[PDB]
Amino acid sequence: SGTILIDLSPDDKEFQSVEEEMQSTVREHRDGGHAGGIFNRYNILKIQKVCNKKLWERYTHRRKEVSEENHNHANERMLFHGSPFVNAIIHKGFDERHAYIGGMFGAGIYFAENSSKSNQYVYGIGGGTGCPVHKDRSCYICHRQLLFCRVTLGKSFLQFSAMAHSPPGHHSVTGRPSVNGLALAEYVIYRGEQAYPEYLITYQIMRPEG
Ligand SMILES: CCCCCc1cc2c(N)cccc2c(=O)[nH]1
Ligand SMILES: [Zn+2]
Numbered sequence: 001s002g003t004i005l006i007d008l009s010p011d012d013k014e015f016q017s018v019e020e021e022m023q024s025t026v027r028e029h030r031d032g033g034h035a036g037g038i039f040n041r042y043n044i045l046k047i048q049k050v051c052n053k054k055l056w057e058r059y060t061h062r063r064k065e066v067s068e069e070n071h072n073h074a075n076e077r078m079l080f081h082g083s084p085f086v087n088a089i090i091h092k093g094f095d096e097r098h099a100y101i102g103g104m105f106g107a108g109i110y111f112a113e114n115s116s117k118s119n120q121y122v123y124g125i126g127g128g129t130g131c132p133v134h135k136d137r138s139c140y141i142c143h144r145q146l147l148f149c150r151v152t153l154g155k156s157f158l159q160f161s162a163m164a165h166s167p168p169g170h171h172s173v174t175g176r177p178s179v180n181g182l183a184l185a186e187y188v189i190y191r192g193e194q195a196y197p198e199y200l201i202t203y204q205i206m207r208p209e210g
Contacts, residue, residue: 001091003055005048005200015047018148018199021078026116027182035127036120037138039205045143046202055093055196059150062193066154066171075153075171079111079187081197082118084128086145090200094192096163100125105173105188106164109195111151113184118146119205140207148199153187166190 008015023041032038067074083089085098094109101107102125112118122144123130123137130137154171160178167173171194177183189195 003052008047022115037205043204048200059196080118081147082121108188108190147197150196152194
């Protein structure tokens with residue numbers, strides 16, 4: 001495929017800053033833990049840099065196009081993605097196969113500021129049937145993987161909220177939380193080339209002590 005994975009050391013400042021973004025963006029969810037499990041923090045087991053020259057140049061080419069359409073502003077963010085297809089994504093890139101057809105902002109590729117939101121989709125929409133081994137959406141034993149991704153939003157359409165195309169004149173959609181005052185924003189792109197899966201994070205959710 002061209003993809004290689006480089007392990008980061010826990011002593012590396014880059015490992016520490018990615019872990020901190022994982023841990024600090026956990027919130028409680030309105031489903032009481034149904035989809036993603038009950039936890040306040042993670043046990044991070046490994047963080048790997050995803051290196052693929054073809055996929056990177058695909059991303060930067062599209063970033064330059066968006067930028068030039070938006071007064072030299074890519075509006076680039078680092079955002080989480082959770083999916084049963086994480087292993088296809090790191091080898092072949094994001095495409096229409098990784099879209100959420102039934103999502104609140106239409107058929108596109110969804111990203112979260114809250115790591116705990118992406119965690120709800122590790123084992124499928126709604127958490128599917130949970131981990132393959134124990135059939136448990138709150139499994140504390142099995143190893144999970146998330147992507148921390150570089151995403152080009154460009155001009156984003158703001159949706160106040162309780163593959164298709166971007167709204168005309170826009171490069172993405174922003175789902176702004178309008179009820180749960182603790183929820184962070186979620187974002188949708190409609191072209192796989194507008195994201196690069198930069199870090200692969202392997203972790204467990206941790207059982208609260210109390
Ligand atoms: C088959 C899995 C496709 C949807 C996965 C998915 C959905 C999703 C969402 N709706 C909002 C915020 C983040 C995510 C995410 O990180 N992943
Ligand atoms: Zn399990």
